[PDB]
Write a protein that binds this ligand. Structure first.
Ligand code: 82M
Ligand code: NAG
Ligand code: NAG
Ligand code: NAG
Ligand code: NAG
Ligand code: NAG
Ligand code: NAG
Ligand code: NAG
Ligand code: NAG
Ligand code: NAG
Ligand code: NAG
Ligand code: NAG
Length: 340
């Protein structure tokens, strides 16, 4: 017998003690090795309630990732609460690795295996595991990168769809590659991302039809963000230690829902609003040579316009900015229980 409970998790990973890559360094000193033959027990006739939007595992992953960035990616100047801090901002080796989250003795993780589980409510096919799957701590806005794919249909996740102030996580069932490059050869901060337009527009059409199921068949419209800070009006992510900010207007145009490569204009930014919430920071300028990251788009963060109740349209804009939602998109199926 068991009950919902919180406890300090530990982490496991396959980090390498000889790598200078910062995720490897961090996990070498903060995690243990992975279990080569992990155990999973499928519980028959067990129904468990889950709530991805109130899951202490998300807060613990946030603290790990804040910890890793604080030790790994130091800016030159840190503008934190009225004080200036100027330190060394050396260039680093940066490429996220999967991190497993694990329960100590007396606790277990219950895992929801319902194929179209939305992250809230009862789950019929539950298993018990000691550790989650490996989760890469990818910090980004607008688009979720390099995550897991939904196994059956596209899933819409929200703490409350009727509340337009709550973020929507769209969980894709098919990857769309995004290929971002600061060319070796000029403007050292100019970059771009290439996306296969046929794939993207097919997936976005499928996202439209899913949202229709949730909004009583109203007309589904995508628009670019209206206001907000740069981090949210742009698709922002970290590639090899450099901060990329990309204009996604071409992705969220309802015209094609147009085969061909979509080229998004991007810029590498040194001056950053810190997702940790600690103010602004300036990092070092870009390394020389070709800077490139090819990622899987596996999810989308959306905000829905208010004030459309008296029309047949619902308008959705790419959003995000609460990085905890990034960890929720991978942790939604897990909860910790204590074993009696
Ligand atoms: C109350 C509060 N206000 C905050 C500010 C508002 N200005 N938000 C940020 O600073 C911010 C959000 C995301 C990012 C970011 C930066 C770089 C990259 Cl690559 C990236 F993917 C994401 N920054 S945070 C916070 C605490 O939750
Ligand atoms: C739960 O498992 C049964 C048997 O494998 C399957 O028929 C059913 O579709 C599953 N439910 C979900 C939500 O995946
Ligand atoms: C990207 O997606 C492909 C297929 O969707 C998958 O085989 C590959 O492992 C993914 N890479 C990631 C998630 O880093
Ligand atoms: C993805 O889900 C949609 C329904 O949301 C479905 O029509 C489509 O077949 C799925 N695609 C794949 C590749 O499973
Ligand atoms: C998720 O499923 C639960 C249970 O079926 C339901 O109460 C809730 O409205 C659903 N939420 C979303 C966002 O689909
Ligand atoms: C969800 O949000 C709507 C609109 O803001 C509100 O009327 C409703 O009570 C909320 N539902 C819950 C369960 O809080
Ligand atoms: C990404 O685009 C560059 C050109 O900008 C190309 O050289 C490279 O092969 C592409 N990578 C993939 C995986 O398509
Ligand atoms: C882009 O996606 C389409 C969709 O299947 C595919 O056929 C094509 O090979 C991809 N690459 C292109 C168009 O360069
Ligand atoms: C949308 O329309 C279809 C008719 O094609 C209907 O069967 C379905 O119930 C409608 N869904 C909603 C959410 O109104
Ligand atoms: C993105 O590009 C479009 C078209 O080039 C432009 O109108 C828009 O202002 C850009 N967005 C931002 C946030 O700069
Ligand atoms: C996604 O995974 C690929 C393959 O490991 C990696 O090269 C790329 O840099 C990752 N993207 C991000 C944004 O971390
Ligand atoms: C919009 O609709 C929601 C849910 O139907 C409702 O709770 C809210 O009061 C409406 N807003 C306005 C401004 O009428």
């Amino acid at each position: 017998v068991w009950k919902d409970a919180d406890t300090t998790l530990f982490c496991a990973s396959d980090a390498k003690a000889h790598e200078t890559e910062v995720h490897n360094v961090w996990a070498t000193h903060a995690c243990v090795p992975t279990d080569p033959n992990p155990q999973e027990i499928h519980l028959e006739n067990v129904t468990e309630n889950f709530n991805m939007w109130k899951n202490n595992m998300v807060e613990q992953m946030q603290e790990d990732v804040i910890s890793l960035w604080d030790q790994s990616l130091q800016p030159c100047v840190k503008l934190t609460g009225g004080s200036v801090i100027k330190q060394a901002c050396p260039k680093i080796s940066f490429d996220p690795i999967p991190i497993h989250y694990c329960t100590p003795a007396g606790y277990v993780i219950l895992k929801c295996n319902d194929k179209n589980f939305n992250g809230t409510g009862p789950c019929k096919n539950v298993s018990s595991v000691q550790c989650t799957h490996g989760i890469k701590p990818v910090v980004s806005t607008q688009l979720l990168l390099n995550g897991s794919l939904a196994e059956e249909e596209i899933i819409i996740r929200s703490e409350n769809l009727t509340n337009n102030a709550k973020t929507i996580i769209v969980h894709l069932n098919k990857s769309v590659e995004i290929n971002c490059t600061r060319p070796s050869n000029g403007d050292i901060r100019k970059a771009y991302c290439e996306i296969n337009g046929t794939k993207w527009n097919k997936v976005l059409k499928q996202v439209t039809e899913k949202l229709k199921e949730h909004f009583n068949n109203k007309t589904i419209i995508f628009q670019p963000p209206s206001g907000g800070d740069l981090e949210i009006t742009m698709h922002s992510f970290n590639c090899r230690g450099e901060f990329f900010y990309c204009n996604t207007t071409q992705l969220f145009n309802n015209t094609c829902i147009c085969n061909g490569t979509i080229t998004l204009p991007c810029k590498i930014k040194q001056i950053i609003n810190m997702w940790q919430g600690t103010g602004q920071a300036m990092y070092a300028p870009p390394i020389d040579g070709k800077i490139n990251c090819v990622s899987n788009i596996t999810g989308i963060l959306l905000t829905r316009d208010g004030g459309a109740n008296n029309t047949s349209n619902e308008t959705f804009r790419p959003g995000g900015g609460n990085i905890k939602d990034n960890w929720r998109s991978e942790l939604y199926k897990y909860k910790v229980v204590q074993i009696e």
